[PDB]
Design an enzyme around this catalytic site. Structure first.
Site, PDB file in Angstrom:
ATOM      1  N   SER A 156      13.226  48.519  30.944  1.00 15.02           N
ATOM      2  CA  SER A 156      12.032  49.525  30.941  1.00 15.02           C
ATOM      3  C   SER A 156      10.997  48.909  30.143  1.00 15.02           C
ATOM      4  O   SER A 156      11.035  47.952  29.561  1.00 15.02           O
ATOM      5  CB  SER A 156      12.895  51.012  30.562  1.00 15.02           C
ATOM      6  OG  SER A 156      13.083  50.824  29.138  1.00 15.02           O
TER       7      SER A 156
ATOM      8  N   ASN B  61       8.035  55.730  27.763  1.00 12.87           N
ATOM      9  CA  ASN B  61       9.163  54.546  28.554  1.00 12.87           C
ATOM     10  C   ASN B  61       9.126  55.311  29.872  1.00 12.87           C
ATOM     11  O   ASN B  61       9.140  56.326  30.565  1.00 12.87           O
ATOM     12  CB  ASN B  61      10.287  54.978  27.707  1.00 12.87           C
ATOM     13  CG  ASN B  61      11.246  53.798  28.066  1.00 12.87           C
ATOM     14  OD1 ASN B  61      11.225  52.692  27.596  1.00 12.87           O
ATOM     15  ND2 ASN B  61      12.175  54.260  29.044  1.00 12.87           N
TER      16      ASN B  61
ATOM     17  N   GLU C 273       3.075  53.190  17.146  1.00 11.37           N
ATOM     18  CA  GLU C 273       3.588  52.806  18.689  1.00 11.37           C
ATOM     19  C   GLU C 273       2.353  51.700  19.093  1.00 11.37           C
ATOM     20  O   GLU C 273       2.987  50.777  19.660  1.00 11.37           O
ATOM     21  CB  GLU C 273       3.506  54.118  19.444  1.00 11.37           C
ATOM     22  CG  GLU C 273       4.725  55.079  19.011  1.00 11.37           C
ATOM     23  CD  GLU C 273       6.062  54.572  19.520  1.00 11.37           C
ATOM     24  OE1 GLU C 273       6.235  53.391  19.640  1.00 11.37           O
ATOM     25  OE2 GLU C 273       6.987  55.194  19.067  1.00 11.37           O
TER      26      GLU C 273
ATOM     27  N   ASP D  34      16.565  46.514  28.316  1.00 11.59           N
ATOM     28  CA  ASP D  34      17.131  47.315  29.357  1.00 11.59           C
ATOM     29  C   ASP D  34      16.227  47.053  30.732  1.00 11.59           C
ATOM     30  O   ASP D  34      16.677  47.681  31.672  1.00 11.59           O
ATOM     31  CB  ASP D  34      17.599  48.765  29.103  1.00 11.59           C
ATOM     32  CG  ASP D  34      16.324  49.701  28.866  1.00 11.59           C
ATOM     33  OD1 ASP D  34      15.210  49.477  29.086  1.00 11.59           O
ATOM     34  OD2 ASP D  34      16.676  50.741  29.085  1.00 11.59           O
TER      35      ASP D  34
ATOM     36  N   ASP E   4       7.562  50.306  27.875  1.00  3.63           N
ATOM     37  CA  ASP E   4       6.746  51.632  27.203  1.00  3.63           C
ATOM     38  C   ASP E   4       5.411  51.331  27.423  1.00  3.63           C
ATOM     39  O   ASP E   4       4.797  50.309  27.094  1.00  3.63           O
ATOM     40  CB  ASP E   4       6.813  51.409  25.815  1.00  3.63           C
ATOM     41  CG  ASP E   4       8.396  51.530  25.074  1.00  3.63           C
ATOM     42  OD1 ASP E   4       9.402  52.011  25.890  1.00  3.63           O
ATOM     43  OD2 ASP E   4       8.815  50.903  24.354  1.00  3.63           O
TER      44      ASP E   4
ATOM     45  N   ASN F 288      11.413  46.384  27.225  1.00  2.00           N
ATOM     46  CA  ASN F 288      12.662  46.664  26.370  1.00  2.00           C
ATOM     47  C   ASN F 288      13.703  45.767  26.943  1.00  2.00           C
ATOM     48  O   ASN F 288      13.725  45.364  28.074  1.00  2.00           O
ATOM     49  CB  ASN F 288      13.111  48.158  26.528  1.00  2.00           C
ATOM     50  CG  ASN F 288      12.045  49.117  25.967  1.00  2.00           C
ATOM     51  OD1 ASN F 288      11.779  48.876  24.626  1.00  2.00           O
ATOM     52  ND2 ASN F 288      11.341  49.835  26.670  1.00  2.00           N
TER      53      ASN F 288
END
Ligand SMILES: [Cl-]
Ligand SMILES: [Cl-]
Ligand SMILES: [Cl-]
Ligand SMILES: [Cl-]
Ligand SMILES: [Cl-]
Ligand SMILES: [Cl-]
Ligand SMILES: [Cl-]
Ligand code: NA
Length: 129
Positions: A50, A59, A35, A48, A52, A46
């Site tokens: 969002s 998220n 990650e 969308d 992380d 992301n």
């Protein structure tokens, strides 16, 4: 902060993540490797909108507030910035909520694709724990 492998295994064990929801410490270390490369300041935007955040790339759609993810929740009740700290307490406490959500560590796509069913005990091999 960029953790060492065994340094992070020890910090995750100190905060009660080892065998949390039945997931051995090597699962958590493996997820953090893919990650974030063990970097607490990792971020990823992301499609969308969002974001992380942190060592476990948690998220903003569900888990933390960043003020810029429309329609999102903040189920860990933290600013997403708390997930970038050198102190992994906020990340670990929020990860315990995520892994309890029903899908276990499948919530982390990188865990499902790169750690699940592998010899994850290699990630803690050699560490004084
Ligand atoms: Cl490594
Ligand atoms: Cl393990
Ligand atoms: Cl928001
Ligand atoms: Cl909320
Ligand atoms: Cl906040
Ligand atoms: Cl820590
Ligand atoms: Cl499970
Ligand atoms: Na949010």
């Amino acid at each position: 902060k960029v953790f060492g492998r065994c340094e992070l295994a020890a910090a995750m064990k100190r905060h009660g993540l080892d065998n949390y929801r039945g997931y051995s410490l090597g699962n958590w270390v493996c997820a953090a490797k893919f990650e974030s490369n063990f970097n607490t300041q990792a971020t990823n935007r992301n499609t969308d909108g969002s974001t992380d955040y942190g060592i476990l790339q948690i998220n903003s759609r569900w888990w933390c507030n960043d003020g810029r993810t429309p329609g999102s929740r903040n189920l860990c009740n933290i600013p997403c910035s708390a997930l970038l700290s050198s102190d992994i307490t906020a990340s670990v406490n929020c990860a315990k909520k995520i892994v309890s959500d029903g899908n276990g560590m499948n919530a982390w796509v990188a865990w499902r694709n790169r750690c699940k069913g592998t010899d994850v005990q290699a990630w803690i091999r050699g560490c004084r724990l």
